[PDB]
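new request in #modeling-help
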Amino acid sequence: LNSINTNSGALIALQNLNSTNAELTQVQQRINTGKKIGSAKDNGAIWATAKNQ
Amino acid sequence: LNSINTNSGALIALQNLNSTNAELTQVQQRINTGKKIGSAKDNGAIWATAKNQ
Amino acid sequence: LNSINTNSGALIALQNLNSTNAELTQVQQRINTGKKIGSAKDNGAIWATAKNQ
Amino acid sequence: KLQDSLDAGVGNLVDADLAKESAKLQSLQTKQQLGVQALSIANQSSSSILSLF
Amino acid sequence: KLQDSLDAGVGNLVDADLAKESAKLQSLQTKQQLGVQALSIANQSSSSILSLF
Amino acid sequence: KLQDSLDAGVGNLVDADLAKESAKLQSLQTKQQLGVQALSIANQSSSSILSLF
Amino acid sequence: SATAGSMNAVKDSLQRGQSTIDVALAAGDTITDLLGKMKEKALAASDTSLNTASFNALKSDFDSLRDQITKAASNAKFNGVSIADGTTTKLSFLANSDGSAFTVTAKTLTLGGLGLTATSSFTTAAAAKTMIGTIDTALQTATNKLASLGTSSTGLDTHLTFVG
Amino acid sequence: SATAGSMNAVKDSLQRGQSTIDVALAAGDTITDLLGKMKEKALAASDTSLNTASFNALKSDFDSLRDQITKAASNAKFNGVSIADGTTTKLSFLANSDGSAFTVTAKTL
Amino acid sequence: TLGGLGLTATSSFTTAAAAKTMIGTIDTALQTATNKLASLGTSSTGLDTHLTFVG
């Protein structure tokens, strides 16, 4: 409280901003590929099933 | 009264300033998450219900 | 009593002024470091715990 | 349609009303500046009696 | 998130509350001036009996 | 793709997180102003005893 | 004065408890996401139009997410102590200068605390259909435990304000 | 002069009473906030569109807030004495140098 | 001394439960110390009052 060395609120705000940036990266990948499952990282089972089909 | 060792008024003023800073932290969390209930700490029952839904 | 060689009251007044100056030095250290425990001298156990953490 | 209803209901449970939060934010920032000023006023109490000596 | 929790915990252990320190600083500076004045008063004791001779 | 992975990995090794640096910068600038004020307070110690003479 | 000065230790302990619960809630975020994905796997595997290769891929994903739950729960420690890894029944933080405790009941987030085991899985569409309900129960108990930990964290913070 | 000097004890006692009531009012802040949240839980649980899991979550929150009330009320002590924890019917502080009391009726929280 | 305060040269704690008991032990030691010092201060004031009377 009233610290000058540690800004806990800034740490949490940065975590929330990073979470938003991660969601934004995911939506950009969906837009440029046209795929909600574009790689094995997105959903490995459905990705492998679609690859075989 | 007219003490130089204890400032009771400063103690109360610091308690009120800390209360304001706590409300400000809460509003900042609502702004960066977009959520009035962003975690189990905010309201555990409604948070758990929203998680399951 | 009514001595010209020994001023006991001045000795006590100097002890009290030195005590005030010591408290003032402590508050100055807290202000310039931002730390209530800035070194092992302040509180060795809590200082060591914070160092390891 | 059911999935959209469930997602909109989760939003009803947890989402912040940001238009309301903007007003709370402005008033809390004013309140914090006033609290710092009130603490400065309370800090001055000890110096009033210095004039008596 | 764990690294942020550990850093915020170190801040909880060692950081000063500077709003509280500002009040302590003002009162201690007043107390130091009063101590110098009290020492000046105690220094005067020997000169009171000069009038008897 | 391998060249892009190597370049992104170099970025993972050396790049600063500027959002975190902005918070560190603000707090360090406050800390520097407080340190200059604390040094000014420490500079005043010699003048306190001038009143005794 | 000595009693007022010992309240600093009480405040340190209550803040330590809030940090421990924070780490548990971060691990609980991970675990509830894993349980939601696992329920999605079991729900898909209960469909009988799947061929064997698709069923096996879903089972493999389910087993991997199950192992990740164990990792998440075991890492939920704050400086060697945990409220969620199952290693204790409760943590007690200082409530006042006499040393009276502020109890926080442990809420185990491991596979055993969720009603699962290290080998939970499905080998047929019928077993996957049953696993749907098993995972629904695991997710419900996980969110209830995390909600209790959040209420305990808020109670610690309210007590810390009172102690100040 | 001895009567005037004994008023210092009367002033100490009245200040002690103000401190005891201050601690009770801080605990009362906690308790009225808890009661408001508990009323919010009971109000939500009386809705019949809730499924069983939501009802149980509300009941669990309500029970936890109820236990926190007991903790808050038991901690409302100033140097071993309380006006709100229920352990006495009243506290009596000095009103004058003859020792006549200034009663404060206990208010159990 | 440590013995006059109800402590010993080896007083310590090895577990959290022993430390919890040591809380009360140290509270008793501090209370007895302040009572002894208050008695010494009253004795000093009594000496000073008697010195004024002797003068």
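bot summary: Chain F has two helices and no strands.
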